[PDB]
Homo-oligomer: A and B are copies of this chain.
Amino acid sequence: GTSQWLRKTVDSAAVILFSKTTCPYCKKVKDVLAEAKIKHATIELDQLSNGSAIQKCLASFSKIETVPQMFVRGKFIGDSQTVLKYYSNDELAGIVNESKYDYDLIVIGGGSGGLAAGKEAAKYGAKTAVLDYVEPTPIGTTWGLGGTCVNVGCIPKKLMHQAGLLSHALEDAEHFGWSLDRSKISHNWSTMVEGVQSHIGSLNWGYKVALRDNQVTYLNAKGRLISPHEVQITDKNQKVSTITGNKIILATGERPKYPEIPGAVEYGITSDDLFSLPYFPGKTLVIGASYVALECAGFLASLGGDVTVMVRSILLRGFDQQMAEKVGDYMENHGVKFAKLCVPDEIKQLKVVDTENNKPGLLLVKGHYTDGKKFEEEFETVIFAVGREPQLSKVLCETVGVKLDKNGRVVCTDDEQTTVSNVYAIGDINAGKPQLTPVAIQAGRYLARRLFAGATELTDYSNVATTVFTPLEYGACGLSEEDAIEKYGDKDIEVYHSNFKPLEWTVAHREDNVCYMKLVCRKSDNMRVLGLHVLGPNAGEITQGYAVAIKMGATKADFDRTIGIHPTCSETFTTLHVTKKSGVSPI
């Protein structure tokens, strides 16, 4: 496959140097490229097991088999003497700038995936543009560069989770001997929001600076792909123009859904609004039951809010349902109210948001339970967390020839390629992929490296660990218990499980037999670990290291031979014994 590899690399790379580490002629070219501040990929052939065969294949493109060999956009440009000739004649800059298109890469969307792809491509000398535009929410919320995670997702969510966790740190402090008067302590929502937004601000600015420093062109503009190589852009001044690019990356992400009921769009809010909400939500209804719903309900409650979650059917559809029940039971036991098997029919306004005193309005929510009981209750704030959807066009998109699925997501190969061959999709819009920030980031970086640096490594989307940052956190890697049973049959599945109590919870007088972990294992495959699950503090820190071991194909015996660190919650994974089949209590 070394012939096809070289062909793909030469044809895709913007600026690439085939080299050897002990070659003084290769060094002379590197010195020239650095002095002229020409960024490029470098492949050192003496570092590759097939490097000699690569040298032979290079003659298909250059007629030579020596190093160095410099290419620009599919075209052999010269050996060392030739490159030096361009340098001394001041032709080199013109040569490396020469292109059929305005850009080697246009990235549409400047979130986790887009920024990662864009910055990484610039590193190998690709002329790169990143387009980002934030369509306002129905109530007008907008924000800066960085995408969902930075502005309206992981970052503000985890920070509000921390604010929530600190509530309980205050309770725990007393049992640890701290003398404070908790009846006189209160939380100020807007102060927290100011601190959160101040940090987000530094991230917005940070990414802009990063794009500058990597010589990526940033356009605060809405992009539309109108042909394989043509992107139509609309600026703030509403000016329309067209830019051309060799490769296009679609990284446009998703936006929250609203249910199709009266008053939803007019009076409700979503996560998009919540994280910069200038008033405190007050008595809140969250509609929905997956991780956005539960994470938001959870930090709101810990801040002292009166919180209700309206659950159509189950919690965290798609997650292990025993773990999901445990996540919910903990939240229920700690003040979060659940309206079970209940759907909303309408929102009616009773009071407008006080914009001067930064206070919430008041809403009437009518709904109904499965049994026929009507739901009718007042809330200061209604939050919809009922899924997220991509914002591209079944028709328009197909007219440029990019195929979307039923749900409006882009159908891609295992190297992120769409049905238009120079066009790729990464992050949340890529059909079938886990919708997480580091996945989008890994995909973008790996994709940029393949396109412009001749890398071969595909993103591995299997066994990607997650954490739901509910009040008690839930970390998982691999399969749910039910999905593993479905795949391999009950008789081939062994589950090791245990309750545990963090040492910190002992003096603090918190629950026995609530924190919980399990390993789902396949008997036939040497007790291969198929799924890991932990409900407990710092679950994400706990889970992460185990995701490496699982990707390497960890078995139970691997876990068993490993010695614990004491005292930690994580060490419980190293001494698990009780199986579910034995019926013995995990307590």
Contacts and interface: CB of A to CB of B under 8 A. Distances in A.
Given A196-B507, A506-B199, A154 B545 contact: no
Interface stretch (A321-329, A361-369, A393-401, A435-443): A435-443
A530 to B, nearest CB: 15
Interface string A170-197: 1011011111110011111111110110
Contact of A189 (B166, B177, B438, B561): B177
A559 interface: yes
A442 B559 CA distance: 13
Interface stretch (A14-22, A84-92, A349-357, A563-571): A563-571
Interface in A425-453: 436-439, 442
Interface in A20-76: none
A574 interface: yes
Contact of A562 (B158, B551, B566): B551
Contacts of A574: 438, 544, 548
A585 to B, nearest CB: 14
A565 B154 CA distance: 10
Nearest to A569: B541
Nearest to A460: B561
Residue among A155, A185, A457, A566 with most chain B CB within 10 A: A566
Residue among A167, A540, A541 with most chain B CB within 10 A: A541
14 contacts: A158-B504, A159-B507, A166-B172, A180-B185, A436-B563, A544-B545, A544-B568, A544-B574, A545-B546, A545-B548, A545-B549, A551-B558, A551-B561, A551-B562
Nearest to A563: B464
B565 A475 contact: yes
B177 A192 contact: yes
A291 to B, nearest CB: 13
A186 B176 contact: no
Query: Lowest 4 A-B CB distances belong to which pairs?
Result: A545-B545, A177-B192, A544-B570, A545-B546
Interface in A550-587: 551-552, 554, 558-559, 561-571, 573-575
Interface string A506-545: 1100000000000000000000000000000010111111
A570 B176 contact: no
Contacts of A575: 438
Residue among A176, A195, A558 with most chain B CB within 10 A: A176
A224 B558 CA distance: 38
Given A159-B504, A546-B548, A566 B154 contact: yes
Contacts of A158: 503-504, 567
A232 interface: no
Nearest to A553: B552
Residue among A193, A545, A552 with most chain B CB within 10 A: A545
Interface string A144-180: 0000010000110011001100110110110111111
Contacts of A172: 162, 166
A301 interface: no
A467 interface: yes
A436 B566 CA distance: 8
Contacts of A154: 566-567
A503 B439 CA distance: 19
A466 B565 contact: yes
Nearest to A504: B162
A547 interface: yes
Nearest to A193: B177
Contacts of A503: 155, 158-159, 162
A457 B557 CA distance: 11
Contact of A175 (B195, B438, B460): B195
A176 B155 contact: no
Given A169-B169, A465-B563, A187 B195 contact: no
A179 B163 CA distance: 12
Contacts of A542: 541, 544-545
A115 to B, nearest CB: 14
A508 to B, nearest CB: 8
